[PDB]
Amino acid sequence: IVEGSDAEIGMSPWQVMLFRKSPQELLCGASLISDRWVLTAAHCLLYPPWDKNFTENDLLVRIGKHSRTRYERNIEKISMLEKIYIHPRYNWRENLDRDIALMKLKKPVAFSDYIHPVCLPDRETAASLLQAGYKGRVTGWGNLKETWTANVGKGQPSVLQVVNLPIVERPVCKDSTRIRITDNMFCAGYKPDEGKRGDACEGDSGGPFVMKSPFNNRWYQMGIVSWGEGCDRDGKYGFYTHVFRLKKWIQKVIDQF
């Protein structure tokens, strides 16, 4: 996260860290949608060009974390995957369309003051909350700067970072990338003339772009950190996966009934 802030403790209890077994390292962010299901970005697990294609054994999921590197014995919970599901029509060849993925835990985690699920939007909430001008929040342990002087500091934060960005008009979004944006995407970030900044960045993928409803007081996950061109560049915006449009696929995979 660029131009963000340290998060407060338990300020985003649905935030999940995607940890790599060997070598140990941070792959991406994710969100907890239920005691046993995790939602992330597909490109975190599968991206041929960068020669990336992980499997259930290669990873670990870490829930209830604040710090990026510490092993939080008393608050975090480490789980193993049972099965991973990637959208059949996820396009990793040209635009990252449908960059979404679900992960099944081996055993349900126990909710706590540091571990709690986020909500998924319904037609009405989506309808009324996803409007240009409205602000959403982004979180992650990703890079703090697009680029930086090697060895002089540490590109990654100590604790979870948070940033609040506004949604941008499709027309504005479309006129900013030579990439082919689709209906399963959306953008956010300030405009050059807005006087503020911020953006997600490498390592932030899979993180949730959430929103709060003043009527029912609950948090809703409207998007997923997906792609971008640089980090925090003027006249450039971050792209997110449209969770609402992909909701039937989620529903189909989950099968609660």
Partner: peptide, 28 residues
């Protein structure tokens, strides 16, 4: 209907976080 979106240390304790208002105001 499963409890969700209500933070144990915030919503559930009538406490709000430091930048939350920035979100809400964007609505009006």
């Amino acid at each position: 209907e499963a409890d969700c979106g209500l933070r144990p240390l915030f919503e559930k304790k009538s406490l709000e976080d430091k930048t939350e208002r920035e979100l809400l105001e964007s609505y009006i």
